[PDB]
Amino acid sequence: QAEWRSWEVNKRLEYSLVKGITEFIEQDTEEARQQATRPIEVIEGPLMDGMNVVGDLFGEGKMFLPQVVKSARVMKQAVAYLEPFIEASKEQGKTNGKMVIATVKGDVGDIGKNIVGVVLQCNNYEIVDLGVMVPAEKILRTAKEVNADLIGLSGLITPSLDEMVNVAKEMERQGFTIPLLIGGATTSKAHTAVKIEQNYSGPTVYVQNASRTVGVVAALLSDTQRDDFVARTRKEYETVRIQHGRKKPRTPPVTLEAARDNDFAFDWQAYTPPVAHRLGVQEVEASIETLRNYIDWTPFFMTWSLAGKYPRILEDEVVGVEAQRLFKDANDMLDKLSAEKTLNPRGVVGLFPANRVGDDIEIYRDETRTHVINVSHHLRQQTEKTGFANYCLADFVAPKLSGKADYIGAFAVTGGLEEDALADAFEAQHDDYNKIMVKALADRLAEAFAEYLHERVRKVYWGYAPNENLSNEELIRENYQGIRPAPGYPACPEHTEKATIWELLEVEKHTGMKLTESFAMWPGASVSGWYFSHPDSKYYAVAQIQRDQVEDYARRKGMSVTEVERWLAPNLGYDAD
Numbered sequence: 001q002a003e004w005r006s007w008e009v010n011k012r013l014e015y016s017l018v019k020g021i022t023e024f025i026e027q028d029t030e031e032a033r034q035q036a037t038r039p040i041e042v043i044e045g046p047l048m049d050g051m052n053v054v055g056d057l058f059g060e061g062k063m064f065l066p067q068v069v070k071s072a073r074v075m076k077q078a079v080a081y082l083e084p085f086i087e088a089s090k091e092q093g094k095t096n097g098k099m100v101i102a103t104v105k106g107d108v109g110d111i112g113k114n115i116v117g118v119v120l121q122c123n124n125y126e127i128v129d130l131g132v133m134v135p136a137e138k139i140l141r142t143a144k145e146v147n148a149d150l151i152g153l154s155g156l157i158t159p160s161l162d163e164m165v166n167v168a169k170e171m172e173r174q175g176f177t178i179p180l181l182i183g184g185a186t187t188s189k190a191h192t193a194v195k196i197e198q199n200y201s202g203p204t205v206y207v208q209n210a211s212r213t214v215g216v217v218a219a220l221l222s223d224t225q226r227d228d229f230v231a232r233t234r235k236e237y238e239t240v241r242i243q244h245g246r247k248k249p250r251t252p253p254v255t256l257e258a259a260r261d262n263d264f265a266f267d268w269q270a271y272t273p274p275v276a277h278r279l280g281v282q283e284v285e286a287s288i289e290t291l292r293n294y295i296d297w298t299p300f301f302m303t304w305s306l307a308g309k310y311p312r313i314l315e316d317e318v319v320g321v322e323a324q325r326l327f328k329d330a331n332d333m334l335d336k337l338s339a340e341k342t343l344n345p346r347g348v349v350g351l352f353p354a355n356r357v358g359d360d361i362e363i364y365r366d367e368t369r370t371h372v373i374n375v376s377h378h379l380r381q382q383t384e385k386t387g388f389a390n391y392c393l394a395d396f397v398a399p400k401l402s403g404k405a406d407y408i409g410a411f412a413v414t415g416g417l418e419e420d421a422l423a424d425a426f427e428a429q430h431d432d433y434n435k436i437m438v439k440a441l442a443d444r445l446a447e448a449f450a451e452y453l454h455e456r457v458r459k460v461y462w463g464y465a466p467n468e469n470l471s472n473e474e475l476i477r478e479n480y481q482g483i484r485p486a487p488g489y490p491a492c493p494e495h496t497e498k499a500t501i502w503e504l505l506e507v508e509k510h511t512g513m514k515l516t517e518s519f520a521m522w523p524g525a526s527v528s529g530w531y532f533s534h535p536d537s538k539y540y541a542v543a544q545i546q547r548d549q550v551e552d553y554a555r556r557k558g559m560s561v562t563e564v565e566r567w568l569a570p571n572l573g574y575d576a577d
């Protein structure tokens with residue numbers, strides 16, 4: 001009764017490590033301890049060798065992320081046993097290097113940084129994760145104290161880009177010398193070479209994914225390829241730098257007043273917006289069982305680095321089988337979470353009477369539309385357009401002057417407040433696998449709540465599409481009437497606008513959701529936005545706007561021209577200043 005459970009205790013570890021088995025991992029690492037001269041030996045011995053096998057099958061394309069991080073669980077759960085033994089010992093082993101990783105200040109994204117983290121650990125590297133929303137002061141202070149070999153920053157939203165710039169400028173002022181690694185959603189080879197590097201004398205390198213990271217950190221910590229690398233990189237960032245400064249034959253921008261004039265052309269007198277069936281703010285609720293169906297799995301696989309749209313991905317050649325397994329692993333947790341009620345999604349919805357006024361939407365106390373209680377600000381496209389209107393989300397709402405009764409909604413949902421706790425429980429058991437899963441699922445559940453809610457709105461709450469019966473795939477295709485733009489996307493860049501959503505719906509109190517200094521939401525698995533009904537509305541990108549609109553927007557927002565320039569950095573069609 002065994003078979004594999006009968007080879008050399010070292011052939012067992014190295015094996016269980018690859019296959020990712022954890023039910024003999026305790027006694028297998030123990031027996032290999034008593035049989036070793038000193039604790040640390042089991043590390044560079046069976047464990048080390050085993051991991052290499054993973055890195056190998058990884059490159060050939062046999063193993064994928066899911067397994068790698070699943071093997072990491074073994075690697076870690078093993079060491080976790082060798083803590084006292086490896087500690088109460090003499091020389092306690094070496095590493096390929098130590099790195100301080102952190103999600104920049106004001107940002108809450110971390111799954112990606114987690115992936116990059118574990119991967120680097122599966123390559124015998126020390127990683128001190130400083131978590132999220134970490135000030136550059138802490139990052140550096142820590143890099144100093146722990147004497148890290150390099151610093152790595154991660155970001156998801158726009159505010160983050162500037163924050164990384166800060167850290168660069170800081171490391172430069174504090175006379176740092178180690179290389180600065182930058183990554184995450186918003187980070188791009190472009191921005192990392194036109195708005196960051198020129199701030200730090202040390203080597204600043206951008207990296208697209210966890211995989212390539214090991215490559216970069218390799219040379220960067222190599223007494224050989226280091227110079228050659230940085231040199232090629234510096235000269236490489238210079239090229240992309242001048243290329244993003246050739247000012248190609250673009251279309252001449254237009255004045256703010258010129259744009260507004262070419263606003264959405266629509267006969268409002270002949271049109272009568274659908275009246276809101278249920279005005280006011282309500283707290284909505286849906287179980288995991290209710291939202292699963294509304295989950296869009298394609299993104300989920302992307303989080304585990306398995307390309308291919310779902311479900312076509314399941315029958316894929318190269319990564320089909322693993323995709324199948326991950327999905328199954330995923331759903332089993334959802335079944336658990338749904339049963340035990342350990343993760344409960346929450347949300348608040350609200351419909352209000354409104355009307356358009358310029359590039360803004362006026363929210364009123366009641367239907368008498370005599371008292372403005374809030375104002376949704378929006379920007380407008382400022383490129384010379386012909387035959388097409390200079391799009392603005394506000395245009396899709398009947399203007400005060402048209403005397404037409406129009407409306408606007410707002411929402412805020414989450415996969416559950418417990419997201420953070422559930423993950424911590426895993427970190428505690430050195431289970432990064434399930435830790436990454438719960439967060440990935442929390443997110444899939446948040447977005448699902450979003451889809452579900454928007455439906456319940458069109459159908460019930462706002463009730464303009466009662467006879468709507470679209471399929472999950474059609475929902476993914478957005479094949480319904482009306483949009484639900486969310487502050488952050490190109491349709492509405494201004495992030496600080498989520499404040500108005502919090503104020504209006506009283507998010508904090510109905511869901512427990514909050515906003516941070518950088519206007520980030522917590523829990524991370526969170527979605528908030530508006531609800532337009534107009535059948536001609538779309539997610540038109542604001543694009544590059546000019547100085548005149550910034551000043552004007554600044555006046556309506558009651559913010560400093562400098563402030564809005566920070567928040568709308570990515571859309572500054574003029575000299576960023």
Ligand code: B12
Pocket residue numbers: 101108109110111112113115116151152153154155156157158159181182183184185186206207208209210211213299302303305443444446447486487488489490498519520521522523524525526527528529
């Ligand atoms: C999952 C996701 C979410 C989640 C939560 C994320 C979280 N908080 O963990 C949900 C659905 C809940 C969500 C919400 C929001 N989202 Co969102 N989201 C995504 C999405 C669909 C997928 C990509 C993804 O995030 N990948 C998994 C991650 C975390 O991996 P990664 O970051 O890409 O990491 C890889 C590398 O970059 C690298 N890496 C990571 N860090 C580091 C560090 C170092 C040092 C190194 C070398 C490498 C490295 O390794 C990874 C490879 O393994 C994208 C679309 C897209 N395709 O870009 C938008 C996107 C990132 N989201 C966006 C925005 C607009 C929002 C919201 C503001 C919307 C709202 N509701 O109001 C909020 C976020 C605020 C909040 N919650 O606090 C934008 C950002 C635009 C911007 N503003 O600059 C995007 C690009 C969408 C768009 N088209 O505009 N989102």
